[PDB]
Structures are given as C-alpha cells and as structure tokens.
C-alpha cells in the first residue's frame, strides 16, 4: 500500500507552536511526500516564492535518510482555480510548453513526479471541452515522462492527479477509463463532505452515510465516492483514498441539538493556529477536547464529533483512521493520502499520542516498510 503525505508551504508560517517546517517530517513515515503548491507562469510550472526552493531542498533531503521515499510537486488547488489550466490545455503548443517545463523543473529540483490538482476541469467556469483536453494533457504528459526515462536511462517520473469527491463534478470533468490508463495514481478527494451551505451539522469525511442522508447527500461518504470511481472504470490499485488531518466546525442553532444533522447558524470561528473559519487542524481539536468538549464517536458514519456550548466539530481521529484503513485494505485500494500531514500532531505536544498520531496509525495498519528504514 502507498501512504502519501501532503506538506503545505504555509504550515511553516503558522504562529509559535503551530509552525511546522518540511525538514522536520519523519522520513520513514510515508511512502510519498507531496509539496503543495507550485504555480504557473506563461504555461510553465514555477515556484510561488523563492523561499519554496529552500522547502524543496529540505523536503528532498529527507530522501538521503529514506532512500525509497518519493517526492511529488502538486500544482493547482482550490484557490488557484481552473482558468490557468483551461488556457494551458487549450492548444498543443501550450501543453508542450507545460510538459517540457515540468520535466525540467522536477529534474532540476530533485522531485520524483507531479501531482496535477486542477479544481476542476468542466466546472467553476472551465468549459465542457476541458474534460477531453485534461485527458489529452494527462496522456501526453505520461508519454513525455516515458520518453525522458528511456532517453536518460533513469526511473520514470510519477504522474498523479487529484480526483473530485462530488458526483456532478466527477461527471463533468473526468474521463475515468482514460485517466486510469495514463495516471500512476488518482488521489480521491474524500473530504470537505460537510455540506456547509445546507444549515445542518455534517461530517467532514464519513466512511458511511447517515440513515438521514437523502438524495445527493447519500453519496457524501468515502464508501459511495470510491464505489463511483470503481463502477466508472478506475483501477482499484491506482485509487489513493483521501484522509483529512482536520475537521470542519459549525455554530449550533441550539446547544441542546448537538448531533449530526442538527441546525446550524454559520461555520465555526477560526482556530488560533490554522486561522480559517469553519476549519480546525487535528492538533487544534485535541486542545478543544482538552478544554472540555464532549467527544462522541458516531458508529453509523464511523467518525467522531465534539461539541462545547454552541461550537461543534466533525473530524477524524485514531479510531476513524484505523477503521478506514481496514476498509481500504478490504476494498483492494492502492493506499491513503494524508491531507495535510502538517495538521496531524507533528510535535506530539497537543494530543500527547506521540508524533504524527493519525499518520502513524496508517503507517502501522497499511504495513508501510522501507528497506532503508529498518
């Protein structure tokens, strides 16, 4: 099984005890480290800031301790949006400029591959034709990686892509059989399933649906999403399940109605370290629990939630990671991807469950072993 772990460039910029640097990632913990994010300039991949080059060096230097460790560079993300990718895939000339810049960039900065994270082809303004053009880009990029490998007599660069977790978004943007042929891995975005706009508490990444989830809500769970990708032609061993190291928060309409599916006023206030309304890192949730929040493990969805007064959080813990890891193995999936590793308890001081408790649960249960680490 694979165990991929994201490192986000902004994690080192969080205040005081929340700051986490890439050089402090345990090199034996994951099979792949993914750096979020690279940007684009004139149809060429590039760094977002010159300081990212120092992060690339620290991240890639971990391969000197774990010689089997692989590193990927992620381009895109929610904030970047669809427009740069739409322009880049629009012509063969722009795709060639991009593919050539990727090979050159990955090799010069010692990355083992690229993670495409276009959010999303075919939606958010991206036209219907981008479903076909994204598949063309992926085929052409895989072919160029094979040709570079043969020309230089070195292992081929890896090619991965994120995959939407929302059915309508999957339908309008992904030619699943073609993408599965050319990609090494598909990182399925099995998280942010809390449906913030419906006015009820919802889980971030439940394994199974709530019996109260009706219609489109019934597909907002790991089991339903992965089943959809498999039913539509994705290779099971190429599927990498998204494991969030954070939760989503809500302000309860009534503090006495504190279960899943209960009425909400708004997303919860930003955390001291992550500073994003409606989100708390796993390390911040540990503080919330230590400061008196009531912890409930919902067996119907196989995920926890916690509440304190009118503040409610739906998240993942050691137990939910354990149960999803067994389900992953039972379903012959390719592995897991921790999103983001920097929101797990990287120091061991917030949760007192040792360093990286969520990720360590996956390393142990997915039998991740490197010959270089024994």
Number of other residues whose CB lies within 10 A of the CB of residue 96: 13
- What is the bridge-based pairing of β-strands 185-188 and 239-244? parallel
Nearest to residue 370, comparing CAs of 65, 24, 28, 23?
28
Supply 323's token pair: 């149960």
Please give the radius of gyration of the chain, using alpha carbons only, rounded to the nearest integer.
20
Q: Which residues contact 188 (CB under 8 A, 6 or more apart)?
A: 162, 163, 165, 225, 226, 229, 239, 240, 241, 242
Q: Which residue has the tokens 């060096």?
A: 57
Q: Which residues contact 78 (CB under 8 A, 6 or more apart)?
A: 119
**Cα distances (angstroms) measured from residue 175 to each of 3, 311, 358:** 25, 41, 33
Nearest to residue 308, comparing CAs of 285, 292, 330?
292
Render the burial of 14-42: b for 16+ CB within 10 Å, e for the rest: beeebebebeebbbbbbbbbbbbbbbbee
**Cα distances (angstroms) measured from residue 358 to each of 5, 43, 152, 321, 345:** 11, 37, 39, 7, 8
The domains of the chain are located at: 2-245+316-365
Q: How far apart are CA 184 and CA 20, in angstroms?
A: 29
Q: How far apart are CA 38 and CA 123, in angstroms?
A: 21
Peptide linkage before 118 cis (omega within 30 of 0): no
Cα–Cα–Cα angle for 142, 119, 176, rounded to 5 degrees:
50
Nearest to residue 320, comparing CAs of 291, 287, 285?
285
Binding-site annotation: residue ranges: 49-50, 76-79, 120, 189-192, 339
- CB-count exposure of residue 273 (10 Å: 0-12, 13-18, 19+): buried
- CB-count exposure of residue 367 (10 Å: 0-12, 13-18, 19+): exposed
- Phi, psi (5° rounding) for residue 87? -65, -45
What CATH superfamily classification does 2-245+316-365 receive?
Glycosidases (3.20.20.80)
Relative orientation angle of helices 130-152 and 92-108, to the nearest 10 degrees: 40
- Given a contact cutoff of 8 angstroms between Cβ atoms, the answer to whether 229 and 163 are in contact is yes
Q: Which residue has the tokens 């030619």?
A: 175
Supply 72's token pair: 């990927």
Binding-site annotation: residue ranges for chitin: 49-50, 76-79, 120, 189-192, 339
Supply 84's token pair: 């740069």
Q: How far apart are CA 203 and CA 120, in angstroms?
A: 23
Nearest to residue 134, comparing CAs of 82, 185, 184, 97?
82
Method: X-ray
Q: Which residue has the tokens 């090494």?
A: 184
Residue 61 CA neighbour count, 13 Å, CB half: 11
Q: What is the 3-state secondary structure (H, E, C) of the chain?
A: CEEEEEEEHHHHHCCHHHCCCHHHCCCCCCCEEEEEEEEEECCEEECCCCHHHHHHHHHHHHHHCCCCCEEEEEEECCCCCCHHHHHHHCCHHHHHHHHHHHHHHHHHCCCCEEEEECCCCCCCCCCCCHHHHHHHHHHHHHHHHHHHHHHHCCCCCEEEEEECCCHHHHHHHCCHHHHHHHCCEEEECCCCCCCHHHCECCCCCCCCCCCCCCHHHHHCCHHHHHHHHHHCCCCHHHEEEEEECEEEEEEECCCCCCCCCCEEEEECCCCCCCCCCCEEEHHHHHHHHHCCCEEEEECCCCEEEEEECCEEEECCCHHHHHHHHHHHHHCCCCEEEEECHHHCCCCCCCCCCCCCHHHHHHHHHCCCCCCCCC
Q: How far apart are CA 269 and CA 267, in angstroms?
A: 7
**Cα distances (angstroms) measured from residue 291 to each of 260, 281, 295, 298:** 21, 15, 11, 21
Render the burial of 164-180: b for 16+ CB within 10 Å, e for the rest: bbbeebbebbbbbebbb
* Resolution value, angstrom units: 1.7
Q: How far apart are CA 264 and CA 254, in angstroms?
A: 8
Supply 292's token pair: 């008196």
- Given a contact cutoff of 8 angstroms between Cβ atoms, the answer to whether 229 and 238 are in contact is no
- Given a contact cutoff of 8 angstroms between Cβ atoms, the answer to whether 288 and 268 are in contact is no
């Amino acid at each position: 099984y694979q165990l991929m772990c994201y490192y986000t460039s902004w994690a080192k910029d969080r205040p005081t005890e929340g700051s986490f640097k890439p050089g402090n990632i345990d090199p034996c913990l994951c099979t792949h480290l993914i750096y979020a994010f690279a940007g684009m300039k004139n149809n060429e991949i590039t760094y977002l800031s010159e300081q990212d080059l120092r992060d690339y060096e620290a991240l890639n230097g971990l391969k000197d301790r774990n010689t089997e460790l692989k590193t990927l560079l992620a381009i895109g993300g929610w904030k970047f949006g669809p427009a740069p990718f739409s322009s880049m895939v629009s012509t063969p000339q722009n795709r060639q400029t991009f593919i050539k810049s990727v090979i050159r960039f990955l090799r010069q900065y010692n990355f083992d591959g690229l993670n495409l994270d276009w959010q999303y082809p075919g939606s958010r303004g991206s036209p219907p034709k981008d479903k076909h053009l994204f598949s063309v880009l992926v085929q052409e990029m895989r072919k160029a990686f094979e040709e570079e490998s043969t020309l230089n007599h070195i292992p081929r660069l890896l090619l991965t892509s994120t995959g939407a977790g929302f059915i309508d978004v999957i339908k309008s943007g992904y030619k699943i059989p073609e993408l599965s042929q050319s990609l090494d891995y598909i990182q399925v975005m099995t998280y942010d399933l809390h449906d913030p706009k419906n006015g009820y508490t919802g889980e971030n990444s439940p394994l199974y649906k709530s019996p109260y989830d009706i219609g489109k809500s019934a597909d907002l769970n790991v089991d339903s999403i992965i089943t959809y990708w498999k039913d539509h032609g994705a290779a099971s061993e190429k599927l990498i399940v998204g494991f969030p190291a954070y939760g989503h928060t809500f302000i309860l309409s009534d503090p006495s109605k504190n279960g899943i599916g209960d009425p909400t006023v708004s997303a919860g206030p930003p955390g001291k370290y992550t500073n994003e309304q409606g989100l708390l890192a796993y390390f911040e949730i540990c503080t919330f629990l230590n400061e008196g929040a009531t912890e409930i493990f919902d067996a119907t969805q196989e995920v926890p939630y916690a509440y304190l007064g009118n503040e409610w959080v739906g998240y993942d813990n050691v137990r939910s990671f354990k149960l999803k890891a067994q389900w992953l193995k039972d379903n012959n999936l390719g592995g897991a991807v921790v999103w983001p590793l920097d929101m797990d308890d990287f120091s061991g001081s917030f949760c007192h469950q040792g360093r990286f408790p969520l990720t360590t649960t996956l390393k142990r249960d997915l039998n991740v072993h490197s010959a270089s680490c024994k």
